[PDB]
Nucleic acid binder design. Sequence first.
RNA 1: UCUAAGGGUCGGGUACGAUCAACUUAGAACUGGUACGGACAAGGGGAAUCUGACUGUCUAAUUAAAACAUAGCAUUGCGAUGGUCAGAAAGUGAUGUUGACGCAAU
RNA 2: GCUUGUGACGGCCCGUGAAAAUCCACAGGAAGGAAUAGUUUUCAUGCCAGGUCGUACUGAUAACCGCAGCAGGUCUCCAAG
RNA 3: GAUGGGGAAGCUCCGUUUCAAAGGCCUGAUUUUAUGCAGGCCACCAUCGAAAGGGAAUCCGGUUAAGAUUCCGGAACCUGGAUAUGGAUUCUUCACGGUAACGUAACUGAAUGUGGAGACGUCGGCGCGAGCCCUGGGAGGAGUUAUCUUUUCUUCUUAAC
Lengths: 77, 91, 112, 63, 252, 135
Amino acid sequence: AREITDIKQFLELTRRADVKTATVKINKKLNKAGKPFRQTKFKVRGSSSLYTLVINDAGKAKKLIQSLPPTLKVNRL
Amino acid sequence: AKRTKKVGITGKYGVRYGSSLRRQVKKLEIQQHARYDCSFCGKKTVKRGAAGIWTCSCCKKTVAGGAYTVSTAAAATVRSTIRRLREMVEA
Amino acid sequence: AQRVTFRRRNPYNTRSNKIKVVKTPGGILRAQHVKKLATRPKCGDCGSALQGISTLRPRQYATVSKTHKTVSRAYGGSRCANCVKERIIRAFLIEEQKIVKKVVKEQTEAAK
Amino acid sequence: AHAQSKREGRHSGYGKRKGTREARLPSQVVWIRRLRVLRRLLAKYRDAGKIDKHLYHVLYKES
Amino acid sequence: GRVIRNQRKGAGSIFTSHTRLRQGAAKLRTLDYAERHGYIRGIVKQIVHDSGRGAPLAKVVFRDPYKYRLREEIFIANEGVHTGQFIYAGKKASLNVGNVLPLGSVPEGTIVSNVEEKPGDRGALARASGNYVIIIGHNPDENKTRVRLPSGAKKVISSDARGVIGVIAGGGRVDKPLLKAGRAFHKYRLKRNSWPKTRGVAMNPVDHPHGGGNHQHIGKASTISRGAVSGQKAGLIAARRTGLLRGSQKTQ
Amino acid sequence: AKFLKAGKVAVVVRGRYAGKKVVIVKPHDEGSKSHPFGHALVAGIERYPLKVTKKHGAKKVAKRTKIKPFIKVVNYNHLLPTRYTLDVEAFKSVVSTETFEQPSQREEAKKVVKKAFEERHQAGKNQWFFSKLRF
RNA sequence: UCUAAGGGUCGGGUACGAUCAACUUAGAACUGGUACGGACAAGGGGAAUCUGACUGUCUAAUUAAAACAUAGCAUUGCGAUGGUCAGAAAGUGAUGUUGACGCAAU
RNA sequence: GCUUGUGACGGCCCGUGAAAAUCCACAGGAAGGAAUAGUUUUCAUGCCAGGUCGUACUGAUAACCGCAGCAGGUCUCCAAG
RNA sequence: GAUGGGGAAGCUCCGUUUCAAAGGCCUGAUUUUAUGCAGGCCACCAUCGAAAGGGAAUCCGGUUAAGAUUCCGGAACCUGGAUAUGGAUUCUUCACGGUAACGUAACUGAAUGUGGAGACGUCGGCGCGAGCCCUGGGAGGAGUUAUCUUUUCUUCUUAAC
Ligand SMILES: [Mg+2]
Ligand SMILES: [Mg+2]
Ligand SMILES: [Mg+2]
Ligand SMILES: [Mg+2]
Ligand SMILES: [Mg+2]
Ligand SMILES: [Mg+2]
Ligand SMILES: [Mg+2]
Ligand SMILES: [Mg+2]
Ligand SMILES: [Mg+2]
Ligand SMILES: [Mg+2]
Ligand SMILES: [Mg+2]
Ligand SMILES: [Mg+2]
Ligand SMILES: [Mg+2]
Ligand SMILES: [Mg+2]
Ligand SMILES: [Mg+2]
Ligand SMILES: [Mg+2]
Ligand SMILES: [Mg+2]
Ligand SMILES: [Mg+2]
Ligand SMILES: [Mg+2]
Ligand SMILES: [Mg+2]
Ligand SMILES: [Mg+2]
Ligand SMILES: [Mg+2]
Ligand SMILES: [Mg+2]
Ligand SMILES: [Mg+2]
Ligand SMILES: [Mg+2]
Ligand SMILES: [Mg+2]
Ligand SMILES: [Mg+2]
Ligand SMILES: [Mg+2]
Ligand SMILES: [Mg+2]
Ligand SMILES: [Mg+2]
Ligand SMILES: [Mg+2]
Ligand SMILES: [Mg+2]
Ligand SMILES: [Mg+2]
Ligand SMILES: [Mg+2]
Ligand SMILES: [Mg+2]
Ligand SMILES: [Mg+2]
Ligand SMILES: [Mg+2]
Ligand SMILES: [Mg+2]
Ligand SMILES: [Mg+2]
Ligand SMILES: [Mg+2]
Ligand SMILES: [Mg+2]
Ligand SMILES: [Mg+2]
Ligand SMILES: [Mg+2]
Ligand SMILES: [Mg+2]
Ligand SMILES: [Mg+2]
Ligand SMILES: [Mg+2]
Ligand SMILES: [Mg+2]
Ligand SMILES: [Mg+2]
Ligand SMILES: [Mg+2]
Ligand SMILES: [Mg+2]
Ligand SMILES: [Mg+2]
Ligand SMILES: [Mg+2]
Ligand SMILES: [Mg+2]
Ligand SMILES: [Mg+2]
Ligand SMILES: [Mg+2]
Ligand SMILES: [Zn+2]
């Protein structure tokens, strides 16, 4: 039920005691008017609500994905 | 463009009930629908709403009055008779 | 085309059984029942809807922070501010005039 | 195709006509159209200054 | 023979009052300490329509001398009384429209509404849309006061009996032709099931002492006796004269 | 007189501090780019000292007599000039334009005013000014 | 098959331009086995007499009427320890959350 | 445009057009509260639990009432060119 | 429609707060021990009566021979109960800011009092929403093609929260 943008605030969800599973989605999507680009949403399941964080730029997303907790149980695509 | 000769508001009743009754109603409807002066704030803004209840549009005061008009002949001639008699008992 | 059925057993058009139509992600129309509308709370002094105050059906007010149920100033979400201005000034004056009554008749009791 | 000839003003003679003139288009509707236009031409000439407020205020009540 | 209509009205089946929308019963304050040794103040907070009633009520709230709380009374609003108006009630209270004073404490000629038959009965005389009573007399020994009621009838009651200064609101209501069956219909719809009225003379004899015959006629004198018995009293009960009241009226 | 002057008491009549009594400490009788209207800087009382009684002893009287103050820029059109009047010298310089803006300075300003109002109250000076106006 | 009238939207120093989107209304040609609200849809009119004013009501299943009601008019009873009415009775009941601009009865 | 919702207005009344459970607010200020550490869950996040009965279908020129798979009767919502 | 009552030979009739000694709550008092007494309120005076009135909270997708706002999937919300962590608050103890209408992520509040919501006729035109209707381009699929039609039909959706 929740969108997120502060990329640090997010990083704490992923390390919230109750947060067991995550999931990463990838969408083909068009930019401005001309070309397209690779969108990536970072979904985290809390007990009560599901926060998702859209990192548009592929670049940001790459190292973001390494960041993800090594014990967090991420569903890829 | 004067719309009718004489029935006025009473035009709604068409031919029914007969001229006399209609006249009688016509007087008291002109009474009851018409806008009056507020004694309190002085704008002609008192309309009726249910017989006897007169309320001021702005400023929201509401005076109990006559059934179709605001001040009833008697009430006021009473009001004077109360004026008079009260003044006997400070004098 | 595409009509719609009531979603509950009550089949009549009572206040508590309004319907709204809606396109689902399925691509079809579907009834959806619609709670009666909330009404704005009203000032106990004059009677206008009082501003600042969120407008919910009365039990929805139990799950909403106290800031949706008030404005700040004394007699918060209860009277209408212009209605409170009136109070204060009258309070002050009547309490003042009270003094003007005492000291005047205290003069009467010495001058009679 | 019909609607084309319709909006080409065809098939609209006295004999293709079954509802009263009133019922086809409310006189009142015509008025509200008409009046709201005069009402708001007045407004812009005022807003511009092509017209002054006093002359506007007459034309309003005059409209 | 069949039980007739006026006998049936009694068991109050379809005949009882229509009650539901009513504001509450109009009554004066209870005759407490304040009201009979001094006066007490209220504000008419609202003057208001009562269904099936001619004249507006006045919601008038007071402080409770014995408990920190408000108590709201329901008054029949006299003419000219208004929202916000302060209302004074008691022996030692002053003589203005809206106030409620013991018939003792008001000079002859005073005009009051909603007056108590006995003291403290919280108001019985003169309540209808327009009516009132006028003090004509005053006898200190056995402190009574004499009034003329709206009927014309004069009556003597105790001075402590309370009344309210002025006349009742909504006067003149009965000057306006109902005009149609409907207005009457809607009128009784908020009173009782008394409308419309079949004439005994159009009923069969099971139905009425006026029923039957090959033309419609009362067929015997329609002035029935006081001592008549139930099922007999229809027409002019106890009548002592009858016919067009030629001549002036008024009670000399 | 230009009566909204140096120590005139008044009852705030709008805003969060409505109904509270103040002391005008400095009038900008007209003007201020910032505040384009006739307005006054006032010290006021926000949380009045609650009544005290003979049953009240020791450190309870201590508590009951604590004042929470405040300071406002406020439109003349929001005061009820009072017939009463209370001295302002101990916090002339505390309450100023400069005092407002920068919270850190407001906070200190109140500290003083609070001491002033709380000394004042004991030795029952100006008693009206500590009697909450009921409404 | 044409013609004319009726609108929206914008920039103008402190007269107009530019396009966008609507079936109404009137007139003018042409045209046909003089037809055209082409099916469908859709008032017969007039002059009087009797009678009830009107709208409303009834005999389910032989009477819808001129009968009942009605507003209007008039008479009667009644100030509560009361009028009219209910009940075997009663610390019972309708009117009555009532009060003569009222309730009850013709 | 059509249906429906809704608003700000306006007409009408000798008609002025329910009640209660329930929820919230305010006036009050009883009380209870820290600096070596208190107060606060009407802010956020987090844990658990939510019983019983109904739930099929017909709703009518055949699932109901009219002796019947009776041309009768039987309350409603949705509504294309 | 029970109840103290009042009638009635009696089956029962009356009355519904009525001529009644009509009850239960908050916490302290307990640290023999679990609940006696300590304040103070509160005097409301049964109960039945609505599957159309009032009313805490759920939606979409998928699924069955036959159930589905009930299953399954995902995403929510309400009520009760527990509660800790983070934030807020306080040395001026119970927040700040705005002239003001008022703002806010919070921002102690018993008795008692009061205000609001629940909660309200009908008809008329006007204004806005939604679903439907009508329609342009385009990207697909279907139909007609002796001849004619850049055509006819059709998909292009978005829930509670
Ligand atoms: Mg269903
Ligand atoms: Mg309706
Ligand atoms: Mg608020
Ligand atoms: Mg808000
Ligand atoms: Mg406070
Ligand atoms: Mg017209
Ligand atoms: Mg326009
Ligand atoms: Mg003008
Ligand atoms: Mg018999
Ligand atoms: Mg009754
Ligand atoms: Mg009847
Ligand atoms: Mg009759
Ligand atoms: Mg009759
Ligand atoms: Mg009659
Ligand atoms: Mg007969
Ligand atoms: Mg007989
Ligand atoms: Mg006889
Ligand atoms: Mg006969
Ligand atoms: Mg006859
Ligand atoms: Mg043109
Ligand atoms: Mg143009
Ligand atoms: Mg007839
Ligand atoms: Mg007829
Ligand atoms: Mg028949
Ligand atoms: Mg028969
Ligand atoms: Mg007929
Ligand atoms: Mg027949
Ligand atoms: Mg006649
Ligand atoms: Mg007895
Ligand atoms: Mg409908
Ligand atoms: Mg109304
Ligand atoms: Mg509220
Ligand atoms: Mg104490
Ligand atoms: Mg919470
Ligand atoms: Mg249980
Ligand atoms: Mg089913
Ligand atoms: Mg079937
Ligand atoms: Mg059967
Ligand atoms: Mg059949
Ligand atoms: Mg019983
Ligand atoms: Mg029940
Ligand atoms: Mg229910
Ligand atoms: Mg319901
Ligand atoms: Mg499904
Ligand atoms: Mg199954
Ligand atoms: Mg099924
Ligand atoms: Mg589920
Ligand atoms: Mg889940
Ligand atoms: Mg909870
Ligand atoms: Mg803060
Ligand atoms: Mg309440
Ligand atoms: Mg209310
Ligand atoms: Mg209702
Ligand atoms: Mg389609
Ligand atoms: Mg919902
Ligand atoms: Zn006024």
